[PDB]
Amino acid sequence: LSLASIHVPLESIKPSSALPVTAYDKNGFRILFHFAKECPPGRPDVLVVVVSMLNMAPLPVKSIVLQAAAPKSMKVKLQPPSGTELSPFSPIQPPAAITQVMLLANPLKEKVRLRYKLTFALGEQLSTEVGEVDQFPPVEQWGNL
Amino acid sequence: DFGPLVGA
Numbered sequence: 001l002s003l004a005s006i007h008v009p010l011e012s013i014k015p016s017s018a019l020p021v022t023a024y025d026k027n028g029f030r031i032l033f034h035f036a037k038e039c040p041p042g043r044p045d046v047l048v049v050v051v052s053m054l055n056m057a058p059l060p061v062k063s064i065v066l067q068a069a070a071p072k073s074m075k076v077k078l079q080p081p082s083g084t085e086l087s088p089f090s091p092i093q094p095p096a097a098i099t100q101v102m103l104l105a106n107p108l109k110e111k112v113r114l115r116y117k118l119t120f121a122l123g124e125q126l127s128t129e130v131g132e133v134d135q136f137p138p139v140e141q142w143g144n145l
Numbered sequence: 146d147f148g149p150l151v152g153a
Contacts, residue, residue, distance in 0.1 A: 065152065066152075067150045067151060067152040068150070068151055069147045069148055069149060069150045069151065070147065070148055070151075071146065071147055071148070072146045072147065072148050074148075075148070076148070076151050077151065078151060078152055078153045079153060080153045081153060100153070115147055115150075117150055
């Protein structure tokens with residue numbers, strides 16, 4: 001099982017009819033998982049997720065690094081992010097967002113659980129946030145979400 | 146039983 005040869009272009013991702021799930025939300029910084037409608041070509045086992053990161057707090061956030069871990073029977077891959085910083089929210093302009101394509105291979109069709117480590121900085125001040133998400137679409141519906 | 150942390 002691998003995901004090495006899989007790269008799903010952001011622009012190519014169609015929306016599913018599912019609601020985004022909250023992976024992390026603290027101090028105006030929320031990360032949601034947007035489940036793609038389709039699977040990569042030839043990969044019915046891969047759930048394509050558009051991870052969004054939004055900053056609604058008055059302070060800017062930089063050095064944003066998201067990492068994930070999946071059950072041994074699965075494989076998780078994170079494509080490069082659209083960026084690593086989020087400007088402070090400003091009523092005058094649309095919120096600053098970062099998107100990161102995450103791929104999850106679940107060949108055996110088991111229940112999905114995803115751990116993550118969020119790392120970022122406010123100025124030089126470091127932050128490390130860890131968590132577990134277990135709100136995913138039924139594996140049976142992957143590919144036609 | 147999880148795998149290791151993975152990053153871009």
